[PDB]
């Protein structure tokens, strides 16, 4: 018989399986769609998470209650030493991807 009181299911099935990731370094599944009329640029970078701290921001958000006021916000610091470019990979399009 039917469930007497409705409730949404616990957790999202979109993030299955809840297994360990196959690699320590994160994988860019998708890069931005390429427009050849734009100038050449890089789409990504790497860094190392160092920790978190607090800032005070002078907010300019018209319509918001905190407009023209100071807001305290949490931030994350990522240590980013420069990357070194060492290679070039070419990709072709096939009916298998």
């Amino acid at each position: 018989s039917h469930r007497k009181y409705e409730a949404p299911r616990h957790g999202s099935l979109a993030f299955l399986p809840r297994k360990r990731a196959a690699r320590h370094r994160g994988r860019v599944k998708s890069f931005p769609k390429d427009d050849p009329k734009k100038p050449v640029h890089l789409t990504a970078a790497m860094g190392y998470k160092a920790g978190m701290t607090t800032i005070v921001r002078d907010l300019d958000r018209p319509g918001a209650k905190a407009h023209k006021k100071e807001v305290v916000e949490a931030v994350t610091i990522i240590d980013c030493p420069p990357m070194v470019v060492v290679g070039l990979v070419g990709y072709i399009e096939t009916p298998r991807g």
Partner: protein, 135 residues
Amino acid sequence: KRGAPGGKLKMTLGLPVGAIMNCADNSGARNLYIIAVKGAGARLNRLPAGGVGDMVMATVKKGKPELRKKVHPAVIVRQAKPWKRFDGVFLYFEDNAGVIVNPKGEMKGSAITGPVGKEAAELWPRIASNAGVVM
């Protein structure tokens, strides 16, 4: 229009259904017993709860006998559970207290004892007009 006011930032809700808080006005009531919170959503087993600036529905347990037989709208003006404002300040009052209003936000009483919160004062102009101290 229902009792829930718009433009209210998220805060820690300190008063669930069943809480008894002080009455900060001179309407004759001494305390207010929360039976419902305006604008509360739907979730299984979750008690509805309100914070400072929220309109609740309350009954009077101590006070004048004429106020005992009705369900009054009330606005929470002070809470003891600590909450954070957008300037990073965590703060709390030394009691939980509210004032009886009508659905339009106008007060039943004519004076407020003690301070009121900035949230309640900003959301309800009659409370702001009847407050002596705003903290």
